[PDB]
Amino acid sequence: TYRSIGSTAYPTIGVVLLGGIANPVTRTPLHTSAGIAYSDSCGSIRSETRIYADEATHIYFNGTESTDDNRSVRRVLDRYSSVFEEAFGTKTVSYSSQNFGILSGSSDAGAASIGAAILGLKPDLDPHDVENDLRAVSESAGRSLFGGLTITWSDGFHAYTEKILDPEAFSGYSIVAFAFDYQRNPSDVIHQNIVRSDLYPARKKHADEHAHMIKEYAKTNDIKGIFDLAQEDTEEYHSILRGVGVNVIRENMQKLISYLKLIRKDYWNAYIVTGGSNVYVAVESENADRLFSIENTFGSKKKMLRIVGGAWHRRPE
């Protein structure tokens, strides 16, 4: 007796960076990882989803209907067919997705907002179980589903996401994102190449250690400790990637990073580079406008970001 439900989720940044998935269908992370959901101050940077009763199955991405390259979304929609039967009176549903202002981490947001829609129609479903199905759409969906600072434990067969700190724990902090024009390496290029490194078995253990250290830091809200560690993790991650032919940190990004080391002598900052052509800089809020004003950006564009919460839905219509 309903016909439609809308949902929203926020994009994510890794703080213990994931590389390697169990297989391209289920996409279970091969090791433990960690991340944060982000948006701007108005929450306008976001991914929105609508799932709705239809006569035939349509899938739309940013307004554009898709004919293929949509098997993962379709798979999730089929597995929860009974949820749509019960709430809408039909198994036949269409899906519409729209991204706003996202830098990196958009597929995570898209996956979580699907989960939020499904959870909105059947709220006694276990979000940790639903997350398992969402990973087929994006392997780090849990970061956006649960929001704040999360850890996703994984042995490559089972993975489990837990929220470690609320977005409020980061209210004294900001992230200035520097967005560069370099074409990014696709997610799958990173996953495929990183597992070739003979450093990879150690990397899996180190990622899990970093997650435990982050959880320790969380006990006393040592946010600087967490971002300092994320930067260390960033540098190991990309060191390994460069060794198997994947160079994310391109020339002007290296130049920005060098400059960041200079001003770190003046006031605290720490940076993160995920899979895309962005440099994310954490900074105490009292220095955020200062950092945001630097003129030496080496061609990049600046966005002011903050840590935000998990995915949510509107009332079904």
Swiss-Prot record:
The keyword Kinase applies. Keywords: ATP-binding, Isoprene biosynthesis, Kinase, Lipid biosynthesis, Lipid metabolism, Nucleotide-binding, Transferase. Substrate binds at residues 18, 139, 143. Changing residue 17 to A: Strong decrease of the affinity for ATP, but almost the same catalytic efficiency compared to the wild-type. ATP binds at residues 95-99, 104-107, 184, 187. GO terms for biological process: isopentenyl diphosphate biosynthetic process, mevalonate pathway. GO terms for molecular function: ATP binding; kinase activity; phosphotransferase activity, alcohol group as acceptor. InterPro entries: GHMP_kinase_C_sf (IPR036554), M3K (IPR048471), M3K_C (IPR048470), MVD-like_N (IPR053859), Ribosomal_Su5_D2-typ_SF (IPR020568), Ribsml_uS5_D2-typ_fold_subgr (IPR014721). Homodimer. This is Mevalonate 3-kinase.
